[PDB]
Design a binder for this molecule. Structure first.
Ligand SMILES: C[C@H]1O[C@H](O[C@H]2[C@H](O)[C@@H](O)[C@@H](O[C@H]3[C@H](O)[C@@H](O)[C@H](O)O[C@@H]3CO)O[C@@H]2CO)[C@H](O)[C@@H](O)[C@@H]1N[C@H]1C=C(CO)[C@@H](O[C@H]2O[C@H](CO)[C@@H](O[C@H]3O[C@H](C)[C@@H](N[C@H]4C=C(CO)[C@@H](O)[C@H](O)[C@H]4O)[C@H](O)[C@H]3O)[C@H](O)[C@H]2O)[C@H](O)[C@H]1O
Ligand SMILES: C[C@H]1O[C@H](O[C@H]2[C@H](O)[C@@H](O)[C@@H](O[C@H]3[C@H](O)[C@@H](O)[C@H](O)O[C@@H]3CO)O[C@@H]2CO)[C@H](O)[C@@H](O)[C@@H]1N[C@H]1C=C(CO)[C@@H](O[C@H]2O[C@H](CO)[C@@H](O[C@H]3O[C@H](C)[C@@H](N[C@H]4C=C(CO)[C@@H](O)[C@H](O)[C@H]4O)[C@H](O)[C@H]3O)[C@H](O)[C@H]2O)[C@H](O)[C@H]1O
Lengths: 518, 518
């Protein structure tokens, strides 16, 4: 219509429509090992479905988990034994009964494990998981046909075969790591791998069958989440452990010497958690090498993650701009150097290979100019953690008035204390600063005040740890960085069920309503 | 530095620097007619400088005024008698004593005017302002030389001459408006204008001298503001009155019939303020005609505003996308229709002619898709008013969780009640809704709770009316839309001075500090 002319009679109702991709929402951070149950550890069975139902009733639409990789021996998902495999100790045994692979009589006696012991859980559950996998590979029915489909899926076998062979070799040998393996296994000579197949054929087929079982139980949890309107946000650990099929089967893509030993290892300089810095110990990526077959190993990680999650947190995102390299012999991280990461070049390859992708940049720590620019050049939202909001002055980016829309706000991460515990240890200048910003009734319910401040944010997504919805103290902390004992063990108390959290559900629902996050 | 290589030793300190154009700030809305003083009305003398000093001590860096045009007879700046002229009743007489144009003995006896009466002020001040202008045009000194410079400034005369001639003709004739003027004055015949100059030469030179005096006092106020770090935000009324030099000297650029009578007039459909809508009564722009000499009249408005202000509010911004046209004979606005505005085409011409300009879009009312898009396509911030936040649900754009960064947040505008008065009339559903969002101590200090909510916003600029800093009731309301009597009259109580507002100053300074607006 030309300037000056009349509009049609429905001009007043030509109102702007809210973008569905801009929808405000809330979520809960809860790793599946924290579910209750009689087998020493949480699993992908009934408790997972009950939690989704409870989460649905709160109005939350996001469930954030830690990485689902097989953890290290202290329970850590961030130096896993493989990059793409699933933690087979998350397999529900009760579910294997529904699938026909176990009979009820075989299910073991319950144990009291108010925290996870990964070794206790392993001794109790692995015999039955192997028995179930044995019955699966023996059968000729529909489930066997689904296993064969899984195996020869081109994008499963490009990681699954190497991982089975690796697990098989490690079962044959007494060595501490693959560094000590004999040269022909260590460097993957065809005949040596052929011999391993012949002598460890059954073990290999069992390992592949256990990965199929994990895959199946997880995809069912995720379908049930989708059915109840819940997206699952996974977690992509930046580094993988030395003793893994990933490092072993792609030596030239890591920073190792001629004999396979790491030249440099991962960590961060002196920070909040340690005076000497955090020495993680992982091997590091030879980025110029990776660049040369298009980061195909990184592109397969993201493809695997797309199959497991709706959305994905990229751990230590800053590491792709610049990474901290410590000499491999060092006993502390504080002696080390910053090195140039792959930058945008990695993310263009992920785009080109995988397509459109929902990524959350965990951009916490030392944030330099090149990190901020990388995050913005791929469009990924960053993070705000309220527990870091009350040091410094009013320009602190974690304070609500400084949040952005394309961002996720946490009360805290799995690396922080709970709110209660954090408030208990808090320095007095930081505490009275926080009282001026927050709305506090009783200090008992400081959790709800912080949760309230997170939801009132302009940030599109607000994530709360289950510990803070339950108002738990420091004994419920999931992880303390720069410590080796007593992490990754927290479980929901055996006496709290998802049917006894109606008050919490309502109180949350009220807040999401109030801040337009339903 | 290539991928994999070491960074230099100052990598940790390559931290991102905050953009100075992103600086958060606060301000006060206060029209100069509201200043105290003995002459029935506020002026650009000592009270203006005292306010700037007080404003500086609070930490605010913005002073927002209403349009400074000569108002209509009820005091309204939004249907002024001219578009570019200054309200000569804002001239300080005490300042004219300092300039040598008046002697102290001539200054009149004080009057008690706790609200402005524009006619009382006109009777009292105009004889002395004319006396002062007479002494100015009679002189041969430095001030006369500055007047001559003002006159022949090419971008002053392209509006000032028409406005003097118009005022001169109106002084000669008994007519109500220029519609009733004889054809040769009405249509600006050369010989008829020549005759006016010869018979009204002195009046004309006096009018031009009064505009010089306004210009001088205003530029001194603005230089003092700049010295104290205070920007002045003006206001660009969208429409100008029928009886003005603007309409008269540019007939073909308005929607008038062959004889000069308006075909259509301005207003808005049925809304919050009136069941029949607001019939403003102004003539309307013939936009296709204006497009044809590049909107040169609009481009001169903005040029004039650049000379008076740092930044400018565009009143009824939505009107440039679509405008409501009511038949001229109508007694209510509710019978009318929406017509297509000039859109981006106007703003490209302003860019091309004036350069870079700091514009605030007053995008309140009925907001259609084409308004949101126009605002965004020129990059202008919009507005949020907290007084409209508590109708509807959690998607209401005036609620703090929905603010954007490129935005100005107000407790209220000059069109709203004060906070106190607003809270006093508030419906009970709206009131308990507000109590859940706001932090309220005593209801007396509801003003400070709303001021707090405005400052805590992510919006880059927060503006508060002086009435709310003083915690005043509805009697201090500046304007009620769709009313004709009792507006534009509010003045600071004669017993409140800027030296007795230390507590207010501190309390504000505390809030700006807390929300990073210092
Ligand atoms: C944890 C987090 O750290 C970095 O960000 C921190 C930052 O450092 C802090 O300063 C702070 O920053 C705030 C700041 O305080 C505020 O002032 C400011 O305003 O805001 C900033 C935030 O912007 O907090 C942030 C965030 O917490 C990183 O940047 C961040 O990405 C990190 N979080 C990630 C990353 C990892 C990486 O793995 C996870 O790390 C966890 O897992 C590892 C691995 O298990 C664990 O390490 C333990 O286990 C190792 C295996 C062990 N290594 C030994 C191994 C051997 C075998 O070879 C031995 O031979 C030898 O003895 C050792 O090498 C480690 O010793 C052991 O510690 C980490 O502890 C654990 O945290 C994080 O979970 C993940 O979220
Ligand atoms: C005022 C404001 O109105 C519009 O926006 C409103 C909106 O209409 C409201 O509904 C509400 O919207 C909210 C809503 O409630 C919420 O639910 C929702 O969530 O948010 C929205 C906000 O987005 O509030 C908004 C904002 O207040 C416009 O869109 C907005 O731009 C307007 N504000 C501007 C514009 C003007 C333009 O004039 C100013 O108007 C003021 O000045 C005029 C001029 O004096 C005054 O009019 C009086 O004086 C006239 C001379 C008189 N005319 C008579 C003349 C005659 C002869 O010619 C007579 O014969 C005849 O009887 C008359 O025509 C008028 O009668 C008289 O009223 C206005 O009253 C005065 O307000 C605003 O100050 C400025 O801020």
């Amino acid at each position: 219509i030309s300037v000056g002319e009349d509009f049609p009679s429905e001009y007043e109702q030509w109102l702007p429509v809210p973008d569905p991709e801009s929808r405000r929402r809330a979520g809960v951070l809860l790793h599946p090992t924290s579910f209750r149950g009689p087998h020493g550890i949480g699993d992908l069975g009934e408790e997972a479905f009950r939690f989704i139902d409870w989460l649905h009733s709160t109005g939350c639409s996001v469930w954030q988990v830690l990485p689902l990789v097989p953890p290290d021996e202290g329970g850590s998902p961030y130096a896993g034994q493989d990059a793409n495999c699933g933690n087979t100790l998350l397999i529900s045994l009760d579910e294997l009964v529904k699938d026909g692979l176990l009979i009820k009589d075989e299910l073991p006696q319950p144990i009291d494990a108010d925290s996870v012991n990964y070794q206790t859980a392993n001794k109790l559950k692995s015999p039955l998981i192997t028995k179930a996998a044995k019955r699966l590979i023996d059968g000729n029915g529909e489930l066997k046909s689904k296993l064969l489909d899984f195996r020869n899926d081109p994008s499963i076998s490009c990681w699954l075969e190497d991982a089975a062979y690796f697990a098989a070799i490690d079962n044959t040998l007494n060595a501490y790591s693959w560094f000590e393996w004999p040269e022909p296994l260590k460097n993957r000579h065809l005949s040596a791998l052929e011999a391993i197949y012949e002598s460890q054929k059954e073990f290999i087929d069992l390992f592949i069958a256990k990965q199929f079982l994990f895959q199946r139980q997880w995809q069912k949890v995720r379908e049930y989440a989708r059915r109840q309107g819940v997206d699952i946000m996974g977690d992509m650990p930046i580094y993988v452990g030395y003793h893994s099929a990933d490092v072993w089967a792609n030596k030239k893509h890591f920073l190792l010497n001629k004999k396979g030993f790491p030249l440099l290892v991962s960590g961060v300089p002196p920070d909040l958690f340690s005076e000497t810095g955090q020495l993680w110990g992982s091997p590091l990526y030879d980025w110029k090498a990776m660049e040369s077959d298009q980061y195909s190993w990184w592109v397969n990680r993201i493809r695997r993650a797309q199959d497991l999650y709706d959305e994905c947190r990229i751990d230590h995102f800053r590491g792709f701009a610049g990474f901290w390299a410590v000499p491999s012999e060092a006993k502390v991280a504080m002696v080390g150097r910053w090195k140039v990461g792959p930058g945008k070049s990695l993310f263009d390859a992920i785009s080109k290979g995988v397509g459109k992708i929902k990524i959350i940049a965990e951009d916490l720590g030392v944030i330099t100019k090149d990190v901020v620019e990388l995050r913005k050049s791929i469009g990924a939202p960053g993070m705000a953690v309220l527990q870091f909001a009350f040091g410094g002055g009013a320009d602190n980016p974690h304070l609500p008035h400084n949040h952005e829309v394309n961002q996720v706000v946490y009360s805290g991460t799995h690396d922080n204390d709970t709110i209660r515990g954090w408030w208990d240890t808090l320095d007095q200048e930081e505490k009275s600063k926080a009282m001026k910003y927050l709305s506090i009734a009783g200090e008992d319910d400081i959790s709800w005040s912080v949760i309230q401040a997170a939801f009132s944010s302009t940030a599109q997504t607000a994530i709360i740890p289950m510990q803070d919805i339950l108002g738990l103290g420091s004994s419920a902390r999931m992880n303390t960085p720069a410590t080796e004992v007593g992490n990754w063990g927290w479980r929901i108390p055996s006496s709290t069920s998802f049917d006894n959290l109606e008050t919490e559900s309502d109180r949350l629902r009220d807040l999401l309503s109030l801040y337009g996050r339903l």
